[PDB]
């Protein structure tokens, strides 16, 4: 009640957006596994050049909406064993096209910076590694 005193029935989708990320975020700050139900196909490792390119993107835009939307995709789009066929979510496809298509289907306001400057070599097979790298940096912006 103390937590939800200042909430009305118009933030719930956003609220479920935040909690389902934050409750996972704590799991990263204890060095445990964030996602234990996602299959290992999406848990690949970023290449060093890809990590170097993604560092620029992480330093470009605010790491709140990006983290939230990526967590939505990882929590309710890649969770089901139905994207094994390339029709739904091909693991060989990139992440920028997947994200832009997702907000196209999510009828939500987007930041064109992510649609523009995000490197296209970031594949969907390596997304959790991005999110962790997307959540580590925010971590090293909180204790300060």
């Amino acid at each position: 009640l103390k937590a939800l005193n200042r909430c009305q029935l118009k933030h719930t989708i956003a609220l479920w957006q935040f909690l389902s990320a934050h409750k996972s975020e704590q799991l990263l700050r204890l060095h445990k596994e964030p996602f234990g139900e996602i299959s290992s196909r999406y848990k690949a490792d970023l290449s060093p050049e890809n990590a170097k390119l993604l560092s620029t993107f992480l330093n470009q835009t605010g790491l709140d909406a990006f983290l939230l939307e990526l967590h939505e995709m990882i929590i309710l789009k890649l969770k089901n064993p139905q994207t094994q066929t390339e029709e739904r979510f091909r693991p060989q496809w990139s992440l920028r096209d997947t994200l832009v298509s997702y907000m196209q289907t999510k009828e939500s306001e987007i930041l064109p910076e992510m649609a523009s400057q995000f490197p296209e070599e970031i594949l969907l097979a390596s997304c959790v590694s991005v999110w962790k790298t997307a959540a580590v940096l925010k971590w090293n912006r909180e204790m300060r």
Binding site: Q26, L27, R29, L30, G36
Partner: protein, 811 residues
Amino acid sequence: VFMMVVCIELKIPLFLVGKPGSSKSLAKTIVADAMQGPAAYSDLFRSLKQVHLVSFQCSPHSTPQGIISTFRQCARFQQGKDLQQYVSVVVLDEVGLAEDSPKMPLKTLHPLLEDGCIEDDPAPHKKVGFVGISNWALDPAKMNRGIFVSRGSPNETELIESAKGICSSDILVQDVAQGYFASFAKAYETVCKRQDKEFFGLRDYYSLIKMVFAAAKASNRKPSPQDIAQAVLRNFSGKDDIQALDIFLANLPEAKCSEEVSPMQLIKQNIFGPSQKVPGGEQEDAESRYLLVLTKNYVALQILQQTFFEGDQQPEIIFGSGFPKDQEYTQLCRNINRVKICMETGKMVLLLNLQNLYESLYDALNQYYVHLGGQKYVDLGLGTHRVKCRVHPNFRLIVIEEKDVVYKHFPIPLINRLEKHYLDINTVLEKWQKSIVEELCAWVEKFINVKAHHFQKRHKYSPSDVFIGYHSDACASVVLQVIERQGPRALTEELHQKVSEEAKSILLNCATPDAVVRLSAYSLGGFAAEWLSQEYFHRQRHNSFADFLQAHLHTADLERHAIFTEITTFSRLLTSHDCEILESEVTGRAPKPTLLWLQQFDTEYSFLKEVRNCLTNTAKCKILIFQTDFEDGIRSAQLIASAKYSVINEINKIRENEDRIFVYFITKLSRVGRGTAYVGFHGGLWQSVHIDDLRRSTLMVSDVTRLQHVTISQLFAPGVSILDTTRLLRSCVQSAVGMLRDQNESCTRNMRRVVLLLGLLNEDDACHASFLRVSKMRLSVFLKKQEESQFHPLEWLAREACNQDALQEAG
């Protein structure tokens, strides 16, 4: 002494520079007492001027205004008095400590030494005497022109002469204890000074000679080993790179016979008098240097407390402040006032503080007393107020400090003024009892995650996740607790097993109840896994805090005054209603346990007042509950530690009765948290016991081991209940209808369904009771039909416990 007398009578600046312990301060103390004009101790000093000392202790942060204020305060006393029978002298302690500071103080000395004023109009009463006693070097230009004298170190002959001077009080016991330990003590003291950096001790050699001479003042004579060994061993025993005993022994083979007294008995012999029973005559000149105990991770306090200080004779702990208030000025004044009270009443002080207080207690630690009426007075200073206070003969001071801080962040003179000793939990355990520490640290690894070759879905655990509050030296603390509870018994083959078993049972106290049945499951029906499960659930009370308290009041030993217990929980802390329920059962032997939340109090004095009003009552057995939510951080641990000693001190104060007192500390931590980590198993009068749920819940049965023999189906079958079925199926209707979907998308009956069902799921009316009965029977039949397709239907408890992800989601 002669130089200060001459330079103070004639008002000549005097700068005394030397190594620590060159007795510059001793000269100062005696001169101040003796000269006192016509109030001197002899006719020689009665014809000399009276002298008032104004002592300012310099520092690297010394503002230039401070020295000017000291000079003007010194000159204010001299105003209105004869300048030929009264003088006031400014004594700057450690005047070399403020030499090259950016806020250069010693630019005001050159004018002040000349006229006594910086730029004001000079007066005949403004020119004051000046003496500066500094351990560090000085520039011979910031003095005006005063006599600057520096001695250095005694090469060899001065050391022998000082030895003879110390040993020149009997003239026959000297010959017993001279000749050998008057040049040989020199010869190895020089070696000790040579082979070490970060200088240790010059007062550590005069004190050594004093201990030898007093030991030679035994029945007839004992300049023998096992008595020279102790005196040499109390030469600094916390360096770890200068073997003090060997250096004396490697050159003297005559006395190579030592019992090797541990640094555990040299603390008794330093605190509980020099002699074991009674010193020769009275104890009037047995002034031993105050103890400084170097420890790792703050374990010396626990070691001492399980050791010597058994109840009434316990010292009062002097700490800092954990509450988010009580600024430095008002807490240091309150921490000097209590040291003064202990000095007056002769009670032991456990100085857990840091260099905040060793700027005021800089002459009390020096132990150069002024005698009057057969009693000793030594001065203490708050701010600029420097005044003498009485010292009772039974006054012993113990400082407990981390070894690294002493090695790097303790001033060298302060290190010299304190008798060093290193005490660690690994230096108090015998070899045989140190093996059951490694055995415990391996049994913990075998306990938290069992070896299994058949189950593959496993989660690797840390020791903290199972034994909450598991630091590095937790097994050592538990073993020390068990050893202290056992007593000084010879090593029987049973003891190597009994002590280990008791330490296993005690270490099991702080294990999560899910982990015990996880062991009972992964090690399928194992003998050890079943013994540790019977112990945790049917012999060692863990259901609720009420059960634990009722079993703890009824089993505690009757020969203890105050009992301290530590409770850790993942549930919510006790409320007023829970303690009212507790009092409804504990009435007859204990009053209402007062509930105090540590995080509400915003001042140490407020907490002290509350606990005093709780203690200053008429009661035989009294229960005190202190509750702190562990809002994880480095801010709540300090608060818990500061409130921990504030209760012990008040327990020691209000002590006249034999009333049993129970103190409980409750920590509210989470299964999955953020930031730091809880460090329990503190050791001492404190035992860590984990009660997962502190309340006697009416939902399920209190003893969760009754659920190992019953499936989910038998709970709903009537024909005194493990589960509250009505509240169960009534607490899910709001979620039981969130999966209903009417065939047509033109109905909002879902909101009406809950209102219907919650009004129907009751027993007030016969039809509602029949509805509940038939619904329960249908649910029981459904669950029975759903259990045929499950492996091991009975042990759903173990399966749920093995689900770490499902444990994290409930607490």
